């Protein structure tokens, strides 16, 4: 409900998203991120990120998603996308989901890194467990390297 | 020493160093200072293993984790989950400290905690006893 600091499960779990309903979706930043420095810039940042990985059109119609193990991101629903990282010289191939994950992967480091905020870090190693996990994990870890 | 910055992406490959016995004495602030309560986690980790149950070495790990170990096979056994299992005493005292982290960050609400949790839990990962760590802790 929070993305407590308390796991809802240790050692090995299936790990499923769950869209946000549309009644709570002006809730969900402060909700989830509430803690960290900053969160109302986060989804900003996010297609800041998208941005710059989209080789040329990418677009969608973006939605929020809650993971059972406390994570939280954005993206649109589970055509390809073709995203290239200049920081790692790297291209991939991608569904519009896929590349969400990506890109709120980057942000989470990234502002982790920036803040010195635990609560950030967390965000990171949740939503990193889902990529870990998914179907498009190798495209995904690909791009963010 | 700790940091909330996390560079890892895939799997990258852990490396656990024992701490040379000139530093023991300050590993627990170190790793763990700024953390509430920080101080009860090594009587803990040893009440953890009463209860799974059998010196202990300290070890950093180059993701910035952190743990304890003691130094045959031991059989453990969680009432939490009725599961037992059979490992090294090194592999009982990652499968302690995990259960310890896990507890104190519920207890707690600290994040750092939580954080301490996951760099131990992907050393679990790549470790050769992996399956009896997580089968303990499921
Ligand atoms: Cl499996």
């Given amino acids: ?6 796991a809802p499960e240790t050692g090995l779990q299936q790990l499923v998203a769950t869209i946000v309903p ?11 991120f509430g803690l960290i420095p900053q969160w ?6 996010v297609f800041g990120w998208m941005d710059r990985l989209c080789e040329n059109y990418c677009g969608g119609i973006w939605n929020l998603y809650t993971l059972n193990n406390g994570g939280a991101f954005m993206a649109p629903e589970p055509e390809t996308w073709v995203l ?19 890109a709120c992967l980057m942000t989470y480091s990234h502002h982790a890194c920036r803040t010195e905020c635990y609560a950030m870090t967390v ?3 949740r939503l990193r467990d889902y990529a870990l996990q998914h179907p498009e994990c190798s495209a995904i ?5």
């Fill in 84 to 102: 290239f990282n200049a920081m790692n010289g790297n291209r991939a191939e991608m569904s519009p989901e896929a590349a969400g994950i990506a």
């Fill in 141 to 145: 870890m690909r791009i963010i390297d």
């Fill in 22 to 32: 549309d009644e709570q979706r002006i809730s969900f930043w402060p909700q989830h």
């Fill in 40 to 45: 109302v810039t986060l989804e900003p940042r």
């Fill in 123 to 125: 965000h990171y190693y």
């Fill in 1 to 6: 409900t929070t993305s407590s600091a308390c």
